[PDB]
Amino acid sequence: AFSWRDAVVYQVYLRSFRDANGDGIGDLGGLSQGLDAIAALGCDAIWLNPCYASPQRDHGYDIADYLTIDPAYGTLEEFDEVVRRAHELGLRVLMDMVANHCSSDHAWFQAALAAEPGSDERARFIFRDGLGPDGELPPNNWDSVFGGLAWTRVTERDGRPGQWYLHSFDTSQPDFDWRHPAVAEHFENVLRFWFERGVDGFRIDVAHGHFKDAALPDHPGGRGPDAGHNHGMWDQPEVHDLYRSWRALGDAYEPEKYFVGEIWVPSPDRLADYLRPDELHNAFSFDLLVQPWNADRFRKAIETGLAVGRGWPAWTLANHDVHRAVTRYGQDLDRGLRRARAAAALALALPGSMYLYQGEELGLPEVLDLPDAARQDPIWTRSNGTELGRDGCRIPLPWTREGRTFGFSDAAAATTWLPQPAWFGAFARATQAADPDSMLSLHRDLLATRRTHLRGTEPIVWLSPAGAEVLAFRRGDVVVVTNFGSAPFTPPSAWGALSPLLASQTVPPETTVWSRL
Amino acid sequence: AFSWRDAVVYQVYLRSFRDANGDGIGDLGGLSQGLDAIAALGCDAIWLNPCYASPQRDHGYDIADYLTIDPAYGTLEEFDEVVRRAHELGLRVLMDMVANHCSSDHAWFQAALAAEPGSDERARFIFRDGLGPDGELPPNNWDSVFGGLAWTRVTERDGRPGQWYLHSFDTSQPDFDWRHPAVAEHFENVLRFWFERGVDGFRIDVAHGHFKDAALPDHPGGRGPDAGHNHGMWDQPEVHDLYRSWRALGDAYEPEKYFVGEIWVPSPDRLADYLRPDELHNAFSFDLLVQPWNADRFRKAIETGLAVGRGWPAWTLANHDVHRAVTRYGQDLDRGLRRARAAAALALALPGSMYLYQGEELGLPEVLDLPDAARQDPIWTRSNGTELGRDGCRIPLPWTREGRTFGFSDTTWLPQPAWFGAFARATQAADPDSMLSLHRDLLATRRTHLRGTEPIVWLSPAGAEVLAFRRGDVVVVTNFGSAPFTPPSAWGALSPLLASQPGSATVPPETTVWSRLHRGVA
């Protein structure tokens, strides 16, 4: 019996999952072809990255129409077949809600640009006069998350430069004014539209966004990484009224809809407010995702996640915004794989839910050596090449050792929207499926054993002392040990007699073992 | 008795005709279910687009094995039953010969890739070292017909980028070296294999292909559509020795086998050499197909076709590579339908044979609005999304008004528009004024009154937008213009047989009328 509390969710980055028509862009027809593989892995749900009409300047997170599928991804009819088939395989379906900003191509923003200062069209966004004698300075000192000014100046009807608009991310992603009532009205309709098609819930992009301080005050810390968190730009009290309204909307359905927030705030007190019983069901536990390979750092991040997350956090070790775990833990392919295997086996034993990013079950490394001309992330161009960006974790997946695109399609290599390295076939899904010791087989074994032997009602009971290189805990009749160090480890007899259930490779170095007690 | 001279051939694009097993792909069981309808319409033969084993990167024209049926379409024994049933209905069967190139999945090409430079395996294809200091430039400046370079570089077994191979069409369609003796031997066997199963003849794909100039010279005209005809890439003298060989094989059967070439050459004089008595029986009269709706242009194309075809050319107004007639002539449904009805009625009165592309008898338009994710034609990707391609004339046919796929199945490999149900065959069959009923009436009347060898006799001039001729006692007038046309008394008293529009002597605008002389009236 399905429970969001314990769900294992497969994150589908549709552009790079599977390409059914051979134009190099992953699509809904390709996801249909691969749903069997996701269900056979043992997942409970899928989360689709944004597949709405988008000019792709931020690869789907710049949305030009929230009620339509992008034609490069398919049709509404193909979408409905994805949902029907996913449901038939026992999978729930989460879509991505991107309501902090839209594409500059969106009809509302085209209207704002064509209207005059102070118009209702501009009042749905954040337009301000510039500073300086000719308005040539930005209205405040905020940085775009992607680098540069968070403001872009527009041209007015008489052809002169005029007001600026705010964009927390790319220049082509203007931020909504969430104090304008039409904004909330539009997005309640977006929720109801997709829920009517059987979508089971939403992952909320930039859940710490939407509302800014009404004064848009300068960040007193300056610009750049050492300025610290910009308290006026994020995480405002009004956002909890928003999430109370969305939760009430989703709770009208049977079963109730599900919301998981993408929240990046420094304070655990601020994070916990998003998780009150009448707001969001969960939020990603990012503390663990950002830790290096270190027993003390892992345990502290786990303790932090359990204490705010009311006992059942949404764990994740990778997503479409960060380097793949094999690369993060390699500091070396052999070392990164061993640690990624142990980390996957540890996180899938934690109480709560787990989000698996496509390709992590294959142990793919990050592709850091892309040619300059191949990169497409706005971070790459906005930083003048000083920040690589995220393309290395978005490479089209290998499905078979054979084929010019390794089974991502039947097409030529030059079609794929990002290039696959010639060695990607070494990580092919079909190869790993035939190998019981593969990363794919480890994930299959983990999900089967987790379902058989663990219950979400069993909390962690720590067995190891704080500070040790060996992390150990009990849940119910299962004992989990992760040896982060270089020395083998014999569990002490006081923990009880142990019978092994699985292992990511005595507890050998850099290995996770599940045992029955 | 049947004659190839005036056969009406139904072109079956199998993937989009009818789906009998519910996977969204047309198949042989679906064709079997529709043979009765083709014969009832009034056709004398079918031509099947390629249905051999193929990965479908060019939807059957990239063949992986020439002695097979693709498993998605059925088995060899199901094909045999289709041929028997077609023959039992009086239909002859043409298959598609695709001998300029094969799929890169073909065993010979897999063997070529696995072998070394200079091997016999590569000698059956056209592998060359690249130009430039590191071989990074293609061996010459030729274009693929679908867009981009006509060459693809391979990786050699030591991992270095190495030789390039030539492909006139997609990268996955390597061209044979027709100077290698094993190629001719292979295709003589292909002919005998299918002829032994009762196939009556072949439509020859890229009949201006096969042989290239042996030096593979750069095209001095450059690249792209303004470069002009690439004389070194096509239409070489050795291709006529090839067709003399195939015709000599076909002439030993009783009745002799039939060859119709798909020939695209810049000059109609160049077409004639392919039609000499020891070569191909016919070639599509593409000059008429490319003309806009205009009386002068149509007449000149018909005169040219009759001359090249020795009086009995193979007419066609559409196929699986061009926009459907309703769209070409409308380019606007009502005007396109009116003109397509008038054009079908004119073309079916010309001396010779006629090829009807499936769906043109329903008056289907081109489906130009497909989403990017639905496009499958290699032209789409190879043009970087700048050329639409051919998928819009390959949409699965509507059979019934009802049903999620309009009776094509019971998702389709290409999506049908919501409005396709308006064109359903069963709806048109019950409507005497439908495009389908017009084709049925045209074919019945053609068989009764245009069954002889009477040539065209052009009638006297009467204005710029009128085309008119007589064959024996049958008079045909097509009014291309916007005004009604009253024929002159000098042509004689005319009794109407049929018209492309539903009681006067005047020919209404954009209409073709067939009439008879000497009926004792007025």
Ligand SMILES: C[C@H]1O[C@H](O[C@H]2[C@H](O)[C@@H](O)[C@@H](O[C@H]3[C@H](O)[C@@H](O)[C@@H](O)O[C@@H]3CO)O[C@@H]2CO)[C@H](O)[C@@H](O)[C@@H]1N[C@H]1C=C(CO)[C@@H](O)[C@H](O)[C@H]1O
């Ligand atoms: C794209 C993303 O930007 C913001 O989030 C954070 C970045 O994802 C991280 O790079 C973060 O840095 C931490 C590292 O991840 C971690 O490994 C460690 O080194 O600590 C770092 C601390 O500097 O920095 C950003 C904030 O701290 C933003 O909050 C988040 O919402 C964004 N993700 C979504 C937003 C957009 C715009 O629609 C999309 O482009 C993304 O794909 C979404 O997933």
Ligand SMILES: C[C@H]1O[C@H](O[C@H]2[C@H](O)[C@@H](O)[C@@H](O[C@H]3[C@H](O)[C@@H](O)[C@@H](O)O[C@@H]3CO)O[C@@H]2CO)[C@H](O)[C@@H](O)[C@@H]1N[C@H]1C=C(CO)[C@@H](O)[C@H](O)[C@H]1O
């Ligand atoms: C697919 C087809 O390509 C070749 O023929 C095409 C010409 O190369 C094009 O230029 C175009 O001709 C047009 C003229 O440019 C224009 O001035 C006007 O006269 O209209 C013409 C027709 O629209 O279109 C031609 C037809 O598409 C090639 O010569 C021909 O053999 C090709 N057809 C077969 C070949 C293959 C490859 O095996 C298949 O993909 C096709 O389905 C076959 O039918």
